[PDB]
Design a binder for this molecule. Sequence first.
Ligand code: HEM
Length: 153
Amino acid sequence: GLSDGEWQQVLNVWGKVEADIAGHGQEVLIRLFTGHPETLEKFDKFKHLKTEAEMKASEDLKKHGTVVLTALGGILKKKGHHEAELKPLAQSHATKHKIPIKYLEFISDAIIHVLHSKHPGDFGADAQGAMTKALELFRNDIAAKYKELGFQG
Ligand code: HEM
């Protein structure tokens, strides 16, 4: 898992996100959708967004970004002891939303990108290492639930 020092770095980085949850959330989703247009198709409510300008102007997209990062933040604050929080998310994303684990990889990468984009020179090598470990743990624990369900896509 992560060391206490690594968790401290993760939660310090997370304070940056908490100062503007909606802005970070919006940028993460836009990075996901523009880099991987197939992901947009999983969202009936965002399929109509045909340009990035439309994405940027969508208040509902910002709202969903807030929902997403709020859930992730709650998980991170558990420092790995997140079974109760993570299980339901894994199960909704596999069974209802049909989100392949690859797309969770994509959004994890998007989070790292957005952190550098919004905080250039202020997301240090140690911080990137710790946040990466935290996102891998999240993804990996979701993957275990996906395997239980026999879910691939
Ligand atoms: C950090 C990773 C993610 C987190 C924390 C997250 C969190 C959430 C939450 C809290 C909800 C609403 C409750 C629920 O249905 O379980 C939700 C809904 C949803 N998620 Fe995710 N999600 C993540 C990644 C993804 C990805 C990568 C996709 C697709 C590429 C996706 C697709 C969806 C869809 C289609 C819904 C239903 C949206 C609606 O129509 O309201 N999620 N997500």
